[PDB]
Design a binder for this molecule. Structure first.
Ligand SMILES: [Mg+2]
Ligand SMILES: [Mg+2]
Ligand SMILES: [Mg+2]
Ligand SMILES: [Mg+2]
Ligand SMILES: [Mg+2]
Ligand SMILES: [Mg+2]
Ligand SMILES: [Mg+2]
Ligand SMILES: [Mg+2]
Ligand SMILES: [Mg+2]
Ligand SMILES: [Mg+2]
Ligand SMILES: [Mg+2]
Ligand SMILES: [Mg+2]
Ligand SMILES: [Mg+2]
Ligand SMILES: [Mg+2]
Ligand SMILES: [Mg+2]
Ligand SMILES: [Mg+2]
Ligand SMILES: [Mg+2]
Ligand SMILES: [Mg+2]
Ligand SMILES: [Mg+2]
Ligand SMILES: [Mg+2]
Ligand SMILES: [Mg+2]
Ligand SMILES: [Mg+2]
Ligand SMILES: [Mg+2]
Ligand SMILES: [Mg+2]
Ligand SMILES: [Mg+2]
Ligand SMILES: [Mg+2]
Ligand SMILES: [Mg+2]
Ligand SMILES: [Mg+2]
Ligand SMILES: [Mg+2]
Ligand SMILES: [Mg+2]
Ligand SMILES: [Mg+2]
Ligand SMILES: [Mg+2]
Ligand SMILES: [Mg+2]
Ligand SMILES: [Mg+2]
Ligand SMILES: [Mg+2]
Ligand SMILES: [Mg+2]
Ligand SMILES: [Mg+2]
Ligand SMILES: [Mg+2]
Ligand SMILES: [Mg+2]
Ligand SMILES: [Mg+2]
Ligand SMILES: [Mg+2]
Ligand SMILES: [Mg+2]
Ligand SMILES: [Mg+2]
Ligand SMILES: [Mg+2]
Ligand SMILES: [Mg+2]
Ligand SMILES: [Mg+2]
Ligand SMILES: [Mg+2]
Ligand SMILES: [Mg+2]
Ligand SMILES: [Mg+2]
Ligand SMILES: [Mg+2]
Ligand SMILES: [Mg+2]
Ligand SMILES: [Mg+2]
Ligand SMILES: [Mg+2]
Ligand SMILES: [Mg+2]
Ligand SMILES: [Mg+2]
Ligand SMILES: [Mg+2]
Ligand SMILES: [Mg+2]
Ligand SMILES: [Mg+2]
Ligand SMILES: [Mg+2]
Ligand SMILES: [Mg+2]
Ligand SMILES: [Mg+2]
Ligand SMILES: [Mg+2]
Ligand SMILES: [Mg+2]
Ligand SMILES: [Mg+2]
Ligand SMILES: [Mg+2]
Ligand SMILES: [Mg+2]
Ligand SMILES: [Mg+2]
Ligand SMILES: [Mg+2]
Ligand SMILES: [Mg+2]
Ligand SMILES: [Mg+2]
Ligand SMILES: [Mg+2]
Ligand SMILES: [Mg+2]
Lengths: 273, 44, 92
RNA sequence: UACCCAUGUCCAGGAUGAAGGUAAGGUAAUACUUACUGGAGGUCCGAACCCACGCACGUUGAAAAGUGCGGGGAUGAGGUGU
RNA sequence: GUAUGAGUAGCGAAAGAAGGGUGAGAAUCCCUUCCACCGAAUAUCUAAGGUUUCCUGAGGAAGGCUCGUCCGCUCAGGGUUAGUCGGGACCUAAGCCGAGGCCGAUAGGCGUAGGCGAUGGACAACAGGUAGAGAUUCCUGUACCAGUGCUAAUUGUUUAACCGAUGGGGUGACACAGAAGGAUAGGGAAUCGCACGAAUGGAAAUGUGCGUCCAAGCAGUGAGUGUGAGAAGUAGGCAAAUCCGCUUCUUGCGAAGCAUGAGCUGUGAUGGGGAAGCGGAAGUUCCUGAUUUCACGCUGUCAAGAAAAGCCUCUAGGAAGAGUAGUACUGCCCGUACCGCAAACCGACACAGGUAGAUGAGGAGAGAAUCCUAAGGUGAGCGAGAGAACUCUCGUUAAGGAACUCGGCAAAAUGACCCCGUAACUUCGGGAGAAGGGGUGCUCUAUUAGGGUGCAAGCCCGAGAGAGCCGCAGUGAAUAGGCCCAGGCGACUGUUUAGCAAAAACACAGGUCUCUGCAAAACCGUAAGGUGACGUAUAGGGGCUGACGCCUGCCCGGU
């Protein structure tokens, strides 16, 4: 659920958070952990190329299975855990082999269920199938774009895509953004919606809470100097004294479309958002 | 008042040392010019 | 390595003479000789039975004689103690 | 010196009493009330530590930016070493 | 190079006095006594840094803001000892280098295998002595770790004792906050020992002063903390596995058994140390009690908390020698002196500044606050004598009490603990220590009523009351909120012009517009290569507004 906090202080006044009712265990699977090091937006050369990053709580990588290519082995859900590296939760699945791996937790996935992948899998929440074996109208997630590569298209918490038709070698999908797209029929997908739907209702409440997650402050361009930003300067507060609002590097920023005009995938996009 | 020079042996030899000079084309240029002028200590 | 070239010369002073009756002998050795080369060199030269060796390294002092500042030589001093059943060394 | 990365370390004492829990009530069951428990916070007072708000002195200075007396933060968007 | 200012300013926070000594020469050097200062430091260690400043014998030209017989200064000789401490021959993080390789007018940039790189991981020694300078290093006593040879039995020999991976697996291996415990260090009383037993009214004892112990290792024990047990069977763990993981059965548990575990007892101790007069007496009982250890052990929370080696195990493999016991021997390189809140480091100075970490006692106290002291350390490198104006830092002022002034600037005032009581407004948490008041000393009832500890002796903690007593005054010193009414701006905590501006400025949580379907947009770079992201529209970049409440109207001609 969503947990409101009592207004004891001025920083806890508007703050809300999840209660983590779905999470089952608090210890990760040791043999599936890899180290991460923060980069703070620093380049290959050490330059700050993407700004407003750096300096949060330290985390550790949990290696996830997006390919889902273990076919014919019944996999049993063991726990549902917390992942700092993504908005959705994850589920630990240990197969009849003895092997264990993490997957994205779908909506309604509970401990004790059995999960299948392949061609003979049933259409149930958690199973992985090729897009040609999925009937029209089902809600899927974790769509992959090239066969054998791994899930990539719908993966954040509460997101879902819907199968929409067939065109021989391709399948129509209505992506979460509202886009209709053509994807090969030999690419896989998982049935269901993605786990943690309430994630968008959280009110951060504090500036320090943004700092905990790795976000440095954002300075507006109107309070800079003329050599710093196309908006800086002027005596007092100044309007946007230009034809259009501008990014820190020129290149208008409001309404100006930035997709390449000679793209090679314009023939696979049926209708844009 | 914390002053500007805070000494350290390692921080000195890693930046101004002989091997640091010899690891670069321009550091070798510096060593060559100091040999030309005739200085007693190169790099250091 | 030619034992007579890694043992240089005895160290004669009040500090050395005070321990000289403890069967401890102080020598000057090369700056490269190790604790065990010294032991075998002594056993080769003086025909004794060495029990321990201790070594220490000395820097060079800074002297002058007016406008001419320089450094004295670099030293490596070894104290050699012989076993109870072994003949002594003279120094005298 | 500014920001960042890896790895360590520091913060005398005292005050307040969030969620939750238990018991007794109250209900068809709940809500709700009262005691006990519990120990949250960019919480409170205040040393070390960090800072620099007022005044005085200094102004060929003890000091090329300090001292004295008061002052702000002091579990955190904290101070600091390599 | 030499004048004038001119024998002028200054001589850099601080308490000294006298008596002896040395000497050509003494406020300044040495010794003695008294006095004074620091004492969560001005004390004890130890990193960085310095690089001989350390010790001894001589010296007085220059340096020392004066003097000097002295010195961190001059001269000459000396002084630093490690299998176990810190670092290499062990391991890895950020980062750096990088065979082939990709990219590029040259130069070169990037990067794979591989390797360097502690601020982190692993790893065997303790207690005393040392009168010029070193001590876990030398010496004494007792140990441990790895290895080697020599003896004596034992066992095994290719259906094969035994070893065992550069491979697999487990451990190593981890955040933050809170509370209750065990123990020990430390501290305090009695007891015990030795000495004194007294100057001025009194005291031969209810007198006074000092002390009132001891490791590592070895053998036992142990508060505790975690903890399922057995047996079958294997689509997985690049090959194999008796090991791990997964499944099914039997058996059931705060009871044992396994891991760890502070500490305690004996030995080490026929040893060492120890108050007084070279020797050496006593070393018991009780109370209090950690910021240390058990121990990130437990509980809770969300922001979800390094890697590799090492150690154990499994096979793949190697195998005719192997361990066992006793003995003797072997163990490399670098640092080790001295300063180290400082006159030896960074500041041109013997500079009122800056400098990481460990320890850091007593009375009163909640306290590392505050005042006075212990151990220990200091008396600050110009003096003496007068007691003018003026300047600085302080202390009191009759009557008035902001009349001063741009402005109550500065100063004065409140200040601890316990009890009573407390408004508008409110986002129901606050406002609030609102405001405004009252009580504190000492004696007796009194080793109280009652608690903690103990088997008891005893020791510690200490509310209410009554009666009294004394002062102008009882938190009698130091330390310790002034408060209220109304308005503007910013919601709040936070940040800012090192060295004139700390704010109404920036940030912020929240709102909205817009771009982006993943080799994403955006950004760095000539490119390769990267960040974004080991992410995927509930995500990422940009513009504006800035908690919260009520709202956000009209115009698309111009750009
Ligand atoms: Mg941004
Ligand atoms: Mg902003
Ligand atoms: Mg500006
Ligand atoms: Mg411009
Ligand atoms: Mg403008
Ligand atoms: Mg402006
Ligand atoms: Mg204007
Ligand atoms: Mg040595
Ligand atoms: Mg960091
Ligand atoms: Mg606070
Ligand atoms: Mg405050
Ligand atoms: Mg500042
Ligand atoms: Mg203060
Ligand atoms: Mg405070
Ligand atoms: Mg004059
Ligand atoms: Mg004068
Ligand atoms: Mg002085
Ligand atoms: Mg005198
Ligand atoms: Mg004092
Ligand atoms: Mg103090
Ligand atoms: Mg050094
Ligand atoms: Mg120097
Ligand atoms: Mg010298
Ligand atoms: Mg000296
Ligand atoms: Mg003189
Ligand atoms: Mg003089
Ligand atoms: Mg000298
Ligand atoms: Mg030894
Ligand atoms: Mg060593
Ligand atoms: Mg070591
Ligand atoms: Mg090459
Ligand atoms: Mg490179
Ligand atoms: Mg590597
Ligand atoms: Mg290394
Ligand atoms: Mg280290
Ligand atoms: Mg060790
Ligand atoms: Mg010494
Ligand atoms: Mg010693
Ligand atoms: Mg881990
Ligand atoms: Mg008398
Ligand atoms: Mg013992
Ligand atoms: Mg825990
Ligand atoms: Mg010292
Ligand atoms: Mg100096
Ligand atoms: Mg001085
Ligand atoms: Mg100083
Ligand atoms: Mg006390
Ligand atoms: Mg104290
Ligand atoms: Mg004393
Ligand atoms: Mg004096
Ligand atoms: Mg008056
Ligand atoms: Mg009066
Ligand atoms: Mg009045
Ligand atoms: Mg008035
Ligand atoms: Mg007037
Ligand atoms: Mg006026
Ligand atoms: Mg004032
Ligand atoms: Mg009683
Ligand atoms: Mg008082
Ligand atoms: Mg006070
Ligand atoms: Mg503000
Ligand atoms: Mg300024
Ligand atoms: Mg790219
Ligand atoms: Mg590219
Ligand atoms: Mg990338
Ligand atoms: Mg939505
Ligand atoms: Mg608003
Ligand atoms: Mg604004
Ligand atoms: Mg609002
Ligand atoms: Mg409008
Ligand atoms: Mg128009
Ligand atoms: Mg138009």
């Amino acid at each position: 659920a969503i947990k409101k906090y009592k207004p004891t202080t001025n920083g806890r006044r508007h703050m809300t958070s999840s209660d983590f009712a779905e999470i089952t265990t608090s210890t990760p699977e040791k043999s599936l952990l890899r180290p991460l090091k923060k980069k703070a937006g620093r380049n290959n050369q050490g330059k700050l190329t993407v700004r407003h990053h750096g300096g949060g709580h330290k985390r550790q990588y949990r290696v996830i299975d997006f390919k889902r290519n273990k076919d014919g082995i019944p996999g049993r859900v063991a726990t549902i855990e917390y992942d700092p590296n993504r908005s959705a939760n994850i589920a630990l699945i240990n197969y009849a082999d003895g092997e264990k791996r993490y997957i994205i937790a779908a909506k309604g996935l509970e401990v004790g269920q059995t999960i299948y992948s392949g061609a003979e899998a049933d259409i149930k929440v958690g199973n992985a199938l090729e897009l040609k074996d999925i009937p029209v109208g089902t809600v899927i997630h974790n769509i992959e774009m090239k066969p054998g590569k791994g899930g990539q298209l719908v993966r954040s918490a509460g997101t879902s895509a819907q199968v929409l038709g067939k065109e021989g070698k391709y399948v129509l999908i209505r992506l979460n953004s509202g886009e209709v797209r053509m994807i090969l029929a030999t690419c896989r997908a998982t049935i269901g919606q993605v786990g943690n739907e309430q994630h968008e209702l959280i009110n951060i409440g504090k500036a320090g809470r943004s700092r905990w997650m790795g976000k440095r402050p954002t300075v507006r361009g109107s309070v800079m100097n003329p050599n710093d930003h196309p908006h800086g300067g002027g005596e007092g507060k100044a309007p946007i004294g230009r034809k259009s609002p501008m990014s820190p590097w020129g290149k208008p920023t409001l309404g100006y479309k930035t997709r390449k005009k000679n793209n090679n995938s314009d023939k696979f996009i049926v209708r844009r958002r | 008042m914390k002053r500007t020079y805070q000494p350290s042996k390692r921080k000195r030899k890693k930046v101004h040392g002989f091997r640091t000079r010899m690891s670069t084309k321009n550091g070798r240029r510096v060593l060559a010019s100091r040999r030309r002028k005739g200085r007693k200590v190169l790099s250091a | 390595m030619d034992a007579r070239d890694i043992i240089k010369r005895p160290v004669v002073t009040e500090e050395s003479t005070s321990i000289l009756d403890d069967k401890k002998y102080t020598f000057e050795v090369d700056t490269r000789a190790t604790k065990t080369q010294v032991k075998y060199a002594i056993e080769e030269i003086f025909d004794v039975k060495v029990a321990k060796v201790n070594v220490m390294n000395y820097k060079g002092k800074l002297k002058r004689m007016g406008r001419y500042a320089g450094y004295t030589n670099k030293r490596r001093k070894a104290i050699v103690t012989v076993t109870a059943d072994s003949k002594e060394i003279q120094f005298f």
